[PDB]
Amino acid sequence: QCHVCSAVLFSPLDLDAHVASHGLHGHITEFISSWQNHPIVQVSADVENRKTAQLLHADTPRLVTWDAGLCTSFKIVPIVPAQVPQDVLAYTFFTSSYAIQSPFPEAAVSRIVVHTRWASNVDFDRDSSVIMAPPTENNIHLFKQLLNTETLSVRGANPLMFRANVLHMLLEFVLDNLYLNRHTGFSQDHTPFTEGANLRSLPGPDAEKWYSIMYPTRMGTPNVSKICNFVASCVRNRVGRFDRAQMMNGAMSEWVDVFETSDALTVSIRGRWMARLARMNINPTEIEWALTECAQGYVTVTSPYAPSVNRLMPYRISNAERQISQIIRVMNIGNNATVIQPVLQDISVLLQRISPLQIDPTIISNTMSTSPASSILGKLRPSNSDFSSFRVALAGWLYNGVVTTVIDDSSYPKDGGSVTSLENLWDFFILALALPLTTDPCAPVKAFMTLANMMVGFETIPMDNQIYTQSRRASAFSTPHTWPRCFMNIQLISPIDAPILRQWAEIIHRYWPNPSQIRYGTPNVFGSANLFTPPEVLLLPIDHQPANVTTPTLDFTNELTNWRARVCELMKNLVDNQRYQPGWTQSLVSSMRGTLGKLKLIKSMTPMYLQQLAPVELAVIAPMLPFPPFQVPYVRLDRDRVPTMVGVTRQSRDTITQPALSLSTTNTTVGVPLALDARAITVALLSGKYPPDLVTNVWYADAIYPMYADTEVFSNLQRDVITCEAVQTLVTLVAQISETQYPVDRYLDWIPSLRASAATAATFAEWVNTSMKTAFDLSDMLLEPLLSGDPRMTQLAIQYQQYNGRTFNVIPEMPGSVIADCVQLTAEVFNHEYNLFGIARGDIIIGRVQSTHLWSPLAPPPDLVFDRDTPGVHIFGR
Amino acid sequence: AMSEWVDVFETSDALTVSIRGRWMARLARMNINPTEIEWALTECAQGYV
Amino acid sequence: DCRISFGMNGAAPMIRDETGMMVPFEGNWIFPLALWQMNTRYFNQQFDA
Amino acid sequence: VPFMVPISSDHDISSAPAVQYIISTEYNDRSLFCTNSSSPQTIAGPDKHIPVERYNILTNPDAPPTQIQLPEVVDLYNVVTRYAYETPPITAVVMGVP
Amino acid sequence: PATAEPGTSNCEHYKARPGIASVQKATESAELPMKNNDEGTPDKRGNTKGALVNEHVEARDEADDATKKQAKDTEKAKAQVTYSDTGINNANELSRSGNVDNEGGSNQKPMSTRIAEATSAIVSKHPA
Ligand SMILES: [Zn+2]
């Protein structure tokens, strides 16, 4: 067995494949625990027979793909073949005869054509290729496949979309050369024209054919030719290897420098994709810091390793590259509840599977031991065990901005109710204890107006106008422009008129739970997608205390227990003196007061749980989520800063355009509304207990480990760079064909095109999307929420406004991506070598020229061309 | 979403363009928004509904 | 605190003291029982030999 | 656009009248690598030798090895670095705290 | 000469107190990525994909669909956490659909045949 990670290895002659993962020489994650024999591994999603494994469901992109073979895209093809009677045919051994090989086509006319990766050994090809026929055949297929879905002549190409074809061709050309030049074996030569140079050898059985193609100075000068008086001009020592590393693994040098055929363009692209992947690596010491910090101090991880230099593991991006991926994922939603149902559903399942809280409703029945007392047993229904509402109410705290939680109208009284009925009093009791747990920005106004609706006719409070009467339903106070002045200022409610209402407003303004915040994750290595929010805080609408299990159940320092006690005392004052309930023939005041005293003094470990162990579990869960939490600040009762509207801005700042509000601004609330059940939230609050033997350092150390064993954070951090990097290649490439105010430098303008509108730009941007998805092998969303309407955009931004109109703009700056400026470099390469890609500049002259002079019409003499400068030339326009 | 209104240079007839413009101007004076509908029905309800 | 470094190239493996020191597998040690209980299988393969 | 250019040759040929209609305006004859490379020279035809400016680090006697002249003319013989890495899986030994 | 050194011997003494088979089956569905939203966006030809519908009627239809999905995932007949018929008058809620294009026009007719009609309105044939 392995004496490093304490892994038991069956059949001990094959632990070399295990200790290779520790860096000790001769799939995705390998976690092993320390208190039990249950190691957990991961594997990719496309594989079959997952025996003792589980999947990685996220689309990780193929960053590191190796490539043997020579690294060029320009090859030389013959056009018109020929052969000459040569003077030298072979070479002089004692008895052997070696043939004469040449690096170039020996034909009569040969010219350079373009084929991406015409000599390359690839382990996973980016499915993109600039494959060009030699220019005596047809070449119009490379300038027709985009924006010609209708065409009057299929053998033609549109003059108005040359630039839209050339930009996509250059995007393909860069975007299929993202490989890493792989080391391979060498071989020593003693040819009389290459002495002792350790030449490169290709993988494959027919390996030694490639030497003539690679090394032009390998053949000598046998006879007199245009190739031979060139080989006679070249230098000799600059061939084969040039430099090697000092470090090795046995016999192989680590990195080498070799002189060979290539092209400067592809080696310049790959030499900076090399630095792009080299910037992102991370040693296991920062991982064992990261998971230790993310586990909230209940679990210490360690990751031993051997000293190595060549180790590469790209998993480190920045906050700026993370926030823009967060903005794209927020724009993905677009007001349908289908894409946010399974997220909240499975977080509600996972909290139930991790949490120690055993919610059984039988505590209420054992306390009652059964009239007003049996009526609440009718209303609560403790024969039910459906508690999805409480776990969804806890799961919705991580999403304040995209979804909001209210109480359904079934939980409210029937016609507003009245205090003369007993069932409406129990309705009010079920409602007022469940209202503080929702992310509704106006929960206290509904909590006040429910009782103000029930007290109609016995006492009155002032309102602002004739219209909004006190007998308005508490459902409709849903937005902060409806908060009444009688609730805003307490002193307008006189104790002579409305004493119980002034008591209720006083209890709301004093003993309502205030928001708080808690630290999670790690911002040093993982970063944070904390938009609108500091980088290590998690906003919660509840106060939290440090965790111990020996605290008493009946402390009134706990604000939820205080809230339950104050609501029970207010209802005791409401019942106490038999006014507000005329027509009760019996005296129900003693029985009602007793069944309120039991509900005040019930033992229940749910308010103990929610302030001690629920934020710990939320902070453990939250950085491992596939959609990391998007929060908007909670305020207790401060009306002047309440969020009403969250939008996403496509355009820049210094411009002024059509006002294109995002779809997410169209909600009456701040996000998509969902209704909960106050019945289930109330009974889950009133009951629930811990197991009678728990130790937290056992329970949480046993609940964290299988959860982190199925982590996907290292794939999400590896996908967010691609999501961030597609945005530059969208905004830079669409600014070439459209017109914007975003300045990028106009790298080709002689190619004609049209000022494209939104439909043409969206069709172009779809091809820009699907080429990157096809090459990086993704299946899920990438860049496509930007496609829906006005793709002529510049700069991502996101905002939210308060009640008083104060907005908060968060503009993440983006670091420079590599695909963007490499495409915009190869455009400047194209500006000087346009001929190699099958395109000519300038224009033509049609006219009869009959002479025996041969001068090749690609290169005209000045004696028969003309222009606007030429005198006696007529110009026709339109 | 659908844009609100556009202006086109199409062929037309400047008399019936004026007729339909004044008909749109007549129908635009008769226009109530959901907030005023809410206020009218609430005040008509005598605060009950 | 228990951080155990493995011993590469014949050197002895070490364990982290309470006062930040790294000690080999000799001498006299003092454990609490819960420290063994939380890491029983990882300590069996390191210490019992 | 259909062009019609003649064929180079290494010996002298017989002149013949050929009429052509479509020409270009500026020099678009850059893609041509070389004409009749097996021959000693080209008597008739568009003459063009091996492009020596593309093979810069060979034929230039005072040139650094790892240089470029990138935006003007791509060089077809360069200095390339070749690596051989590994990507080990995520390993962690998860320990408990008392 | 290894005679099975006395460090290791397995019998599976400790069982997981929350349960590995119970925690992992919920983490398998927390691992799942967000569902794609494709409608409103153009295809390779140029047509905006999706159904032809009023956008607000569609945004009410997905509230219906996700309420039924909630009711099926909670293994019951009626949903408890309902996404439709809540208290809030969400009458201006818009969603993406195939009714409008990326320009701002309608999609009663596809774009790939709008452009075909606009070009086919101009031809020129040979004389007889
Ligand atoms: Zn191992």
Probe site for chain A from E11, E12, E31, E73 (most A CB atoms < 10 A): E31
Candidates A704, A768, A695, A780; CA nearest to A735 is A768
Sign of CA dihedral A245, A251, A252, A254: negative
The three-state secondary structure class of A122 is strand
Candidates A47, A33, A58; CA nearest to A780 is A58
CB contact under 8 A, B42 and A471: no
Helix (H) or strand (E) holding A610: helix A606-610
The three-state secondary structure class of E28 is helix
C-alpha A385/C-alpha A383 separation (Å) is 7
The answer to whether E118 touches B16, Cβ cutoff 8 Å, is no
The answer to whether C40 touches A35, Cβ cutoff 8 Å, is yes
Exposure class string for A334-365: b at 16+ Cβ within 10 A, else e: bbbbbbbbbbbbbbbbbbbbbbbbebebebbe
C-alpha A91/C-alpha A514 separation (Å) is 93
C-alpha E104/C-alpha A758 separation (Å) is 9
Residue A582: Cβ within 10 Å count = 8
How many Cα atoms are found within 13 Å in the side-chain-facing hemisphere of E94? 15
Helix (H) or strand (E) holding E116: helix E111-120
The alpha-carbon gap from B31 to the nearest alpha carbon of chain A, in Å, equals 21
State the structure-solving technique: cryo-EM
The answer to whether A369 touches A594, Cβ cutoff 8 Å, is no
Helix (H) or strand (E) holding A74: strand A74-80
CB contact under 8 A, C38 and A36: no
The position carrying tokens 């951090």 is A717
C-alpha A58/C-alpha A716 separation (Å) is 7
Residue of A nearest to C3 (CA): A302
Of C32, C37, C42, which is closest to D95 when you measure between CB atoms? C42
Residue A163 is given by DSSP the state: H
Q: What is the DSSP string of A406-468?
A: EE-GGGS-SSS--TTSHHHHHHHHHHHHHGGGS--TTSHHHHHHHHHHHTTTT-----SSSSS
| Ligand 1 mean position, distance from CA A254 (Å) | 24
Residue A531: Cβ within 10 Å count = 23
Decide if E57 touches B, using CB distance below 8 A: no
What the block records as the tokens of A605 is 């470990």
**Strand extents, DSSP E, A769-834:** 797-801, 807-810
Q: What is the DSSP string of A833-856?
A: --GGGT---S-EEEEEEEES----
CA A126 to chain centre: 22
The backbone region for D3, taken as left when phi is positive above 0, alpha when psi lies in -120 to 50, beta otherwise, is beta
CA A149 to chain centre: 33
CB contact under 8 A, A35 and C40: yes
What is the biggest distance separating any 2 CA atoms in chain B, rounded to whole angstroms?
A: 55
| Ligand 1 mean position, distance from CA A2 (Å) | 5
Contacting B with CB below 8 Å, chain A residues are 466-469, 471-472, 663, 789
Q: Where are the alpha helices (DSSP H) in A677-712?
A: 678-686, 696-709
Instruction: Spell out which residues of chain A touch residue C45, defining contact as CB-CB under 8 Å.
Output: 1, 3, 6
CA distances from A291 to A318, A355, A620, B5, B43 (A): 18, 20, 10, 56, 61
Decide if E8 touches C, using CB distance below 8 A: yes
| Ligand 1 mean position, distance from CA A15 (Å) | 8
The position carrying tokens 């969206």 is A762
Residue of C nearest to A32 (CA): C42
CB contact under 8 A, C44 and E7: yes
- The total number of residues shown for chain C amounts to 49
The position carrying tokens 């070009």 is E119
The answer to whether A776 touches A718, Cβ cutoff 8 Å, is no
Residue of A nearest to B3 (CA): A660
Contacts of residue D69, Cβ cutoff 8 Å, sequence gap at least 6: A264, D56, D75
Q: Letter for the amino acid at A132?
A: M
Instruction: Spell out which residues of chain E touch residue A392, defining contact as CB-CB under 8 Å.
Output: 81
Binding residues of A: 2, 4-5, 18, 22
Helix (H) or strand (E) holding A727: helix A713-737
C-alpha A373/C-alpha A376 separation (Å) is 6
Of E8, E74, E90, which is closest to A386 when you measure between CB atoms? E74
Of B1, B39, B48, which is closest to A467 when you measure between CB atoms? B39
C-alpha A315/C-alpha A716 separation (Å) is 9
CB contact under 8 A, D98 and C2: no
**Number of A–C residue contacts, CB under 8 Å:** 33
CB contact under 8 A, A302 and C39: no
C-alpha A73/C-alpha A138 separation (Å) is 20
The backbone region for A28, taken as left when phi is positive above 0, alpha when psi lies in -120 to 50, beta otherwise, is alpha
Contacts of residue A582, Cβ cutoff 8 Å, sequence gap at least 6: A420
Q: What is the resolution of this structure in A?
A: 3.4
Binding residues of A for Zn(2+): 2, 4-5, 18, 22
C-alpha A757/C-alpha E42 separation (Å) is 14
The answer to whether A725 touches A817, Cβ cutoff 8 Å, is yes
C-alpha A212/C-alpha A101 separation (Å) is 6
- The total number of residues shown for chain E amounts to 128
Q: In the complex, which subunits touch E with 3 or more CB pairs below 8 angstroms?
A: A, B, C
Partners of D79 in the beta sheet? A259
Contacts of residue A69, Cβ cutoff 8 Å, sequence gap at least 6: A117, A119, A120, A121, A202
Residue of C nearest to E8 (CA): C45
Candidates A688, A689, A681, A676; CA nearest to A380 is A681
Residue A223 is given by DSSP the state: S
Contacting A with CB below 8 Å, chain C residues are 1-6, 8, 34, 37-42, 45-46
The position carrying tokens 């520790």 is A22
What the block records as the tokens of A296 is 């909230």
Q: Letter for the amino acid at C21?
A: M
The position carrying tokens 């019996």 is A586
Contacts of residue A214, Cβ cutoff 8 Å, sequence gap at least 6: A70, A103, A199, A200, A260, A261
C-alpha D61/C-alpha A768 separation (Å) is 44
What the block records as the tokens of B40 is 């009218």
The three-state secondary structure class of A533 is coil
Candidates A182, A200, A174, A183; CA nearest to A266 is A174
The answer to whether A48 touches A38, Cβ cutoff 8 Å, is no
What the block records as the tokens of E13 is 């003494």
> Strand A299-302 to strand D90-96: parallel, antiparallel, or no bridges (unpaired)?
antiparallel
Residue C9: Cβ within 10 Å count = 5
Instruction: Spell out which residues of chain D touch residue C35, defining contact as CB-CB under 8 Å.
Output: 98
Of D24, D91, D96, which is closest to A701 when you measure between CB atoms? D96
C-alpha A286/C-alpha A289 separation (Å) is 5
| Ligand 1 mean position, distance from CA C42 (Å) | 12
Instruction: Spell out which residues of chain A touch residue D32, defining contact as CB-CB under 8 Å.
Output: 109, 111-112, 858
CB contact under 8 A, A466 and B43: yes
The alpha-carbon gap from C35 to the nearest alpha carbon of chain A, in Å, equals 11
Exposure class string for A267-302: b at 16+ Cβ within 10 A, else e: bbbbeebeebbeebebebebbbbbbbbbbbebbbbb
Helix (H) or strand (E) holding A229: helix A228-231
Q: Do chains E and D touch (3 or more CB pairs under 8 A)?
A: no
The alpha-carbon gap from A828 to the nearest alpha carbon of chain C, in Å, equals 53
Residue A629 is given by DSSP the state: -
CB contact under 8 A, A264 and D24: no
Helix (H) or strand (E) holding A487: helix A485-488
C-alpha C10/C-alpha C16 separation (Å) is 19
Near ion ligand 1, which residues have CB within 5 Å? A 2, 4-5, 7, 18
- The alpha carbons of chain C give a radius of gyration, in whole angstroms, of 11
Q: In the complex, which subunits touch B with 3 or more CB pairs below 8 angstroms?
A: A, E
Probe site for chain E from C41, C46, C47 (most E CB atoms < 10 A): C41
